[PDB]
Write a protein that binds this ligand. Structure first.
Ligand code: GDP
Length: 183
């Protein structure tokens, strides 16, 4: 049986680089393809970037209990979420699975699939994070203050997770995750 790992953390912090490394380290890693009801952009392959389904079917799947999690996107313009069946099918086939979602999504997935292992990817310190949120200082004080506030709230609830990986160094963050996914 493949391990299922749900990767989340602070919302203002992109994890695509970490995801990219894991996929390079674990050759047969199945990165969860979210379902969505928005249309494909050119270059997007159905079954690879998303599973593109229409609003009516997405609702069916909600009603049948077939999303581990879902959400309204851009205030309900469309929906996206994680399909249960591919995740379980991959796992039973023995392939390891990584799901990368926001915090509400990971919380929701722990309920619908409790054998999944949730991981909060934490900053090495509050100051490391703060520095990155201020960044180049191209945003307004109001916006930055909101980010810093948002971040402290999110950091304060990392204890809801099965596991904390402190991202001190990319390669050892990635090493800890590899261990959870196959070790
Ligand atoms: N709840 C939930 N949100 C998703 C899922 N997939 C994508 N999203 C959200 O949709 C937003 C925008 O999608 P897009 O611009 O194509 O790139 P993305 O940011 O990687 O998803 C993201 O901020 C995600 O939080 C999912 O499976 N579940």
């Amino acid at each position: 049986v493949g391990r299922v790992v749900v990767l989340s953390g602070p919302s203002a912090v992109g994890k695509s680089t970490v995801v990219r490394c894991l996929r390079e380290r674990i050759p047969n890693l199945h990165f969860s393809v979210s379902a969505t009801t928005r249309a494909p952009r050119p270059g997007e392959v159905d079954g690879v970037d998303y599973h593109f389904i229409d609003p009516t079917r997405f609702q069916q799947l909600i009603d049948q209990g077939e999303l581990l999690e879902w959400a309204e996107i851009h205030g309900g313009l469309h929906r996206s979420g994680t399909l249960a069946q591919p995740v379980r099918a991959a796992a039973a086939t023995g392939v390891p699975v990584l799901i990368e979602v926001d915090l509400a999504g990971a919380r929701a997935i722990k309920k619908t699939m409790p054998e999944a292992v949730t991981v909060f990817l934490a900053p090495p310190s509050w100051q490391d994070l703060q520095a990155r949120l201020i960044g180049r200082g191209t945003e307004t004080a109001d916006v930055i203050q909101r980010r810093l506030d948002t971040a402290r709230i999110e950091l304060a609830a990392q204890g809801d997770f099965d596991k904390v990986v402190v991202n001190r160094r990319l390669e050892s963050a990635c090493a800890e995750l590899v261990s959870l996914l196959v070790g």
